[PDB]
């Protein structure tokens, strides 16, 4: 099997340096050039350059000549990308991909690594604040009722949210986390029949592994 | 120099439909054009190379065509496996450039948003803050706009919005909205309103509450 | 017509040049394992499977792509490449421009100088108006490759390949230019990293051939030959024949006068396959026979020998006529 396996995710501060690994297998490493493509979260793919795996010679797009450097370790079948003096604008997923052109194929990026996400932030590790969202005291009950969990001000990703220790999966909407300054906010809704709440218990489980925290907030009425 | 313009940005399609997406180069790239597919949370995969040739292992329903400056990618009878993002890319002088991307989302009939408003929890209030939360669940199509109104006046600053991907089960979209206030500012007003405009309704969908109840 | 007048005495005694490097033929290099050649090579049907005419003018392509590596544009190697099959101006074949060498690209970078690469002088120019990029003039290695530009690797087949030009020394200022033109004089030299001569160039496993190129294989004790001339090398540009750092030989498939003649008249009725047109090469002490096939290849009765035959004692050439290739061509020193 031909594959390119990339190094794990990194989380760095502005100004720091990162080095990403991309290890090939299943083919002759020095016979095919490796290109680097990057993608900011939600945006498109920007091409960065290639490193000739036979000679070690790198070529860069002009925007990347300053702080980016391609290298390789032939003995390890591995290519490296190093970024110096990290900016916010460097936060992206970085792909190494194998270039092919010849014998009826190409020009093409034929095989892609799984990607490496470089997160850039100056935030300090913070536990989340969990708040139970019950309907306001003066609200009318239909056949269904929706309850909420609000998770505010944590860093870094990720936080995990379950309802009733996982026993509630239908009608649960856990939303993508977003920034509030440089901390994260997350919310989660669960919709249940009115005949089961507040009759039976609905709690919200939130776990933040980076800060070793497990909050369980039960939703009680008003 | 050569910039790539893809069109359209996104289109909603159903299984069995035939779809054409377009990539236009700012100068001649002499058919040195590749097409890639990227699925949510994955790495891109090669579809077409040299404008008109399917990569090894790509189903026959995919079709690439073009020359000079105008190229197109055709998918005959979109199977369920075809949803995701599509990119064109040129190999005519560095920098090699990718198009902006076309997102193929799955089609369905309209759905009314279920709106729920939640006042600040009594726990957060005693901790200095005040967040009003609004959920707008299971609606279609994706385009929706939410406005917060405090005592009838719209509050622009202080709101965070989160949109989900298309749902893996019912193909709908959901949205979350939080209006964050100082505790003092929250206690100086009465009516907090979450106002949504969507195709399914003509009047805006509204859910409010007054602090004094 | 009789092809006898195609190989007269001046062709192998000082005047005739080889059809690859245009150097004065001074030897016959047998190839015991055989080889193929199509570029600037003609057969007795008036046809070539190559992409060059029997002349040495300029290599000229108007639609490639140029770039330079590193983060600095000064005193840097310049890379130019184009797809095989895009020499639209060339009426002979769209594979490569007329005069592009038929040798697989020898990769290199930085300070290292490629070994045994075809090198020519020229640079990059502007395809929309014809103006030169004056800061890109240098000596460039030219060859066929795959995986250009990310990692040019040598190839010896044309379909799907790329033609590649890369300066062996740093150009004054490198440029990144799409639809860039290449201009290089068609008379070439051999790249060497130092003063030492190398083996004859190109070796059989470096020659690039188009689809359908017939091969030259042994027939009994008859072995196909190349024509060896003294070609200059970049490592010691002054060295000529009998140099103290060794004598560099370049090799071609035909004497250029033979190629020219074969390309002006049709000789289809002079030979059938299985026959040589034989000339007798008379030396100072002894003689030998040279045989020409319908595919335009020359043979000698030297069997498995790869020793180079010196021609400095050749006196005159006499035509013999058609002879069966079942008969071992005479070789008597």
From TrEMBL, chain C:
<protein>
    <recommendedName>
        <fullName>Genome polyprotein</fullName>
    </recommendedName>
</protein>
<comment type="function">
    <text>Replicates genomic and antigenomic RNA by recognizing replications specific signals. Also transcribes a subgenomic mRNA by initiating RNA synthesis internally on antigenomic RNA. This sgRNA codes for structural proteins. Catalyzes the covalent attachment VPg with viral RNAs.</text>
</comment>
<comment type="function">
    <text>Displays NTPase activity, but no helicase activity. Induces the formation of convoluted membranes derived from the host ER. These remodeled membranes probably form the viral factories that contain the replication complex. Together with NS2 and NS4, initiates the formation of the replication complex.</text>
</comment>
């Amino acid at each position: 099997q031909i594959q390119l396996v990339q190094s794990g995710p990194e989380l760095k501060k502005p100004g720091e340096t990162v080095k990403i690994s991309c290890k090939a297998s299943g083919y002759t490493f020095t016979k095919y050039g490796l290109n680097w493509v990057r993608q900011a979260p939600g945006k498109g793919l920007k091409w960065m350059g290639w490193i000739d795996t036979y000679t070690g010679e790198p070529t860069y797009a002009d925007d990347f000549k300053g702080r980016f450097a391609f290298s390789l370790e032939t003995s390890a079948n591995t290519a490296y990308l190093q970024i110096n003096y990290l900016k916010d604008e460097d936060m992206a997923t970085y792909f190494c991909t194998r270039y092919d052109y010849g014998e009826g194929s190409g020009p093409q990026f034929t095989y892609w690594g799984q990607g490496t996400l470089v997160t850039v932030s100056a935030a300090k590790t913070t536990p989340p604040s969990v708040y139970p969202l019950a309907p306001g005291s003066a609200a009318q009950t239909n056949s269904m009722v929706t309850l909420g969990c609000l998770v505010k001000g944590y860093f870094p990703e990720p936080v995990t949210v379950t309802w009733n220790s996982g026993s509630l999966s239908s009608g649960v909407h856990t939303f993508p986390a977003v920034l509030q300054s440089d901390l994260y906010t997350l919310s989660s809704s669960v919709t249940v029949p009115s005949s089961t709440w507040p009759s039976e218990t609905v709690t919200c489980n939130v776990a933040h592994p980076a800060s070793s925290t497990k909050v369980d907030k039960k939703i009680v009425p008003r | 120099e050569l910039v790539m313009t893809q069109t359209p940005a996104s289109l909603s399609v159903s299984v069995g439909e035939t779809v054409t997406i377009t990539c236009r180069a700012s100068d001649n790239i002499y058919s040195n054009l590749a097409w890639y597919q990227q699925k949510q949370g994955k790495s891109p995969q090669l579809l077409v190379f040299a404008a008109t040739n399917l990569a090894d292992g790509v189903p026959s329903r995919f079709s690439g065509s073009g020359s000079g400056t105008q190229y197109s990618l055709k998918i005959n009878s979109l199977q369920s496996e075809d949803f995701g993002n599509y990119y064109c890319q040129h190999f005519w002088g560095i920098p090699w450039t990718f198009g902006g991307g076309t997102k193929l989302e799955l089609k369905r009939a309209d759905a009314a948003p279920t709106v729920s408003i939640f006042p600040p929890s009594s726990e957060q209030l005693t901790s200095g803050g005040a967040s009003v939360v609004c959920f707008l669940n299971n609606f279609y199509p994706k385009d929706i706009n939410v406005k917060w109104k405090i005592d009838g006046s719209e509050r622009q600053n202080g709101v965070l919005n989160s949109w989900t991907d298309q749902d893996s089960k019912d193909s709908t979209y959901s949205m979350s909205s939080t209006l964050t206030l100082t505790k003092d500012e929250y206690e100086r007003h009465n009516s907090y309103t979450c106002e949504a405009t969507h195709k399914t309704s003509t009047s805006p969908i509204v859910k409010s509450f007054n602090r004094n109840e | 017509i009789s092809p006898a007048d195609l190989l007269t005495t001046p062709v192998l005694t000082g005047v005739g040049t080889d059809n690859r490097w245009n150097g004065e033929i001074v030897g016959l290099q047998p190839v015991p394992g055989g080889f193929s050649t199509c570029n600037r090579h003609w057969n007795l049907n008036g046809s070539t499977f190559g992409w060059s005419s029997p002349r040495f003018a300029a290599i000229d392509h108007d639609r490639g792509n140029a770039s330079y590596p590193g983060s600095s544009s000064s005193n840097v190697l310049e890379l130019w490449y184009a797809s095989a099959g895009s020499a639209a101006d060339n009426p002979i074949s769209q594979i490569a421009p007329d005069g592009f060498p038929d040798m697989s690209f020898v990769p290199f970078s930085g300070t290292t100088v490629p070994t045994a690469g075809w090198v020519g002088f020229g640079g990059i120019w502007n395809s929309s108006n014809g103006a030169p990029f004056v800061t890109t003039v240098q000596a460039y290695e030219l060859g066929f490759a795959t995986g250009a530009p990310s990692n040019p690797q040598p190839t010896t087949t044309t379909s799907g390949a790329q033609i590649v030009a890369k300066s062996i020394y740093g150009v004054a200022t490198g440029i990144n230019q799409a639809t860039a033109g290449l201009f290089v004089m068609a008379s070439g030299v051999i790249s060497t990293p130092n003063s030492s001569a190398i083996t004859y160039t190109p070796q059989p496993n470096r020659i690039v051939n188009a689809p359908g190129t017939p091969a030259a294989a042994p027939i009994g004790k008859n072995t196909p030959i190349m024509f060896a001339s003294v070609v200059r090398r970049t490592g010691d540009i002054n060295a000529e024949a009998g140099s103290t750092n060794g004598t560099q030989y370049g090799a071609g498939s035909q004497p250029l006068p033979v190629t020219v003649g074969l390309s002006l008249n049709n000789y289809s009725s002079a030979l059938m396959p299985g026959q040589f047109f034989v000339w007798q090469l008379n030396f100072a002490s002894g003689f030998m026979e040279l045989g020409l096939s319908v595919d335009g290849y020359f043979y000698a009765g030297t069997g498995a020998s790869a020793t180079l035959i010196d021609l400095s004692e050749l006196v005159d050439i006499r035509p013999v006529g058609p002879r069966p290739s079942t008969s071992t061509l005479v070789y008597n020193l």
